[PDB]
Design an enzyme around this catalytic site. Structure first.
Site, short mmCIF file in Angstrom:
data_model
loop_
_atom_site.label_atom_id
_atom_site.label_comp_id
_atom_site.label_asym_id
_atom_site.label_seq_id
_atom_site.Cartn_x
_atom_site.Cartn_y
_atom_site.Cartn_z
N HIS A 32 2.74 107.06 32.45
CA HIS A 32 3.69 106.92 30.97
C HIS A 32 5.41 106.70 31.37
CE1 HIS A 32 0.11 106.60 28.97
NE2 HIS A 32 0.29 105.11 28.90
N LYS A 56 -10.01 102.01 18.77
CA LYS A 56 -10.30 102.92 18.64
C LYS A 56 -10.03 104.20 18.18
CE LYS A 56 -12.38 105.07 22.75
NZ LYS A 56 -11.53 105.43 24.12
N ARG A 105 -0.86 97.61 35.71
CA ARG A 105 -1.61 98.24 36.60
C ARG A 105 -2.81 97.33 37.32
NH1 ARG A 105 -2.86 102.58 33.13
NH2 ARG A 105 -4.94 101.23 32.18
N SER A 143 -4.84 107.73 30.65
CA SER A 143 -4.70 108.72 29.08
C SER A 143 -6.33 108.56 28.94
CB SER A 143 -4.11 107.80 27.45
OG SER A 143 -3.17 108.23 27.43
#
Lengths: 173, 159
Positions: A32, A56, A105, A143
């Site tokens: 990030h 979530k 990504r 993460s």
């Protein structure tokens, strides 16, 4: 020529750029940090927008996420960290941003990202989505992954800034 | 301070999709060069001179855009031109893999060059130079996909 025109965005050269980089950043990783560092080099201003209420339940609450990110990015003069609880297009409008930063990504993400960009174009035509590829170094981290490795005592010191690493260790006893 | 971006391609010929990408890029960066590859591996329908001329006309109305041919390593051209940004349009999933690879290589060759990706507008999301040529070769209507100058030139190539 203000008394004739306020001026349009397109066809008239370079304009002031203000970008938002939204995410859950639970917590912010070196990946990030790399994306926002690159964005901040090419746009006048950048807001790291942290989603208040992700679907979530996050490991770190909003306050914690905002605090960790603020520290991690304090060395970038044209970057600011904020929480938000709205559509990214609405936050962007509220913040008078004209650029939306998205990390790219995986190939699996591409279709979804294109779709979101089309939706954002519909919601806010004056907002441009811009896509950055992660550096090879950070291309496999997330993460989620770092949390899972850390939960079972794997070494993740290489993937996080020190402040975040400490906070994560504390969360895991 | 300054941002100077390069948008490389073969542009054989430039389409409305290319025009959209560069218009968007030119709104966010101080200067943009449309970099047209001189010697693509597959021989183009239009030579470099023709490609450059068509593009120049099609983009003349964008004050901070310049059209140039190039025939060397993108990192060398970008260095020679003092560019710090590389623009790519990203239409398909198949292109993404290839572009990510090139970006990794370009990072190795020129760390100070940042690659940036834009998605095409929904209107232009299925068009490509190749596709428009194939349709046009068999008399399909492609007026909606090209600027007038390019459309005329393409008609001439096929007569």
């Amino acid at each position: 020529m203000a008394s004739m025109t306020g001026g349009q965005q397109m066809g008239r050269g370079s304009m002031s750029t203000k970008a938002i980089y939204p995410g859950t950043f639970d917590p912010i990783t070196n990946g990030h940090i790399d994306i926002i560092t690159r964005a901040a080099s090419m746009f006048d201003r950048v807001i790291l927008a942290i989603a208040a209420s992700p679907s979530k339940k996050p490991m770190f609450d909003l306050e914690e996420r905002v605090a960790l990110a603020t520290t991690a990015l304090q060395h970038l003069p044209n970057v600011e960290v904020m929480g938000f609880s709205d559509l990214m297009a609405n936050f962007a409008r509220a913040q008078q941003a004209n650029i939306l930063i998205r990390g790219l990504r995986a190939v699996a993400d591409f279709e979804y990202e294109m779709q979101l960009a089309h939706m954002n174009r519909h919601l806010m035509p004056e907002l441009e989505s811009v896509f950055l590829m992660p550096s090879k170094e950070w291309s496999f981290i997330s993460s989620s992954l770092v949390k899972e490795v850390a939960r079972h005592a794997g070494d993740v010191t290489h993937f996080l800034p020190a402040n975040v690493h400490q906070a994560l260790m504390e969360k895991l006893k």
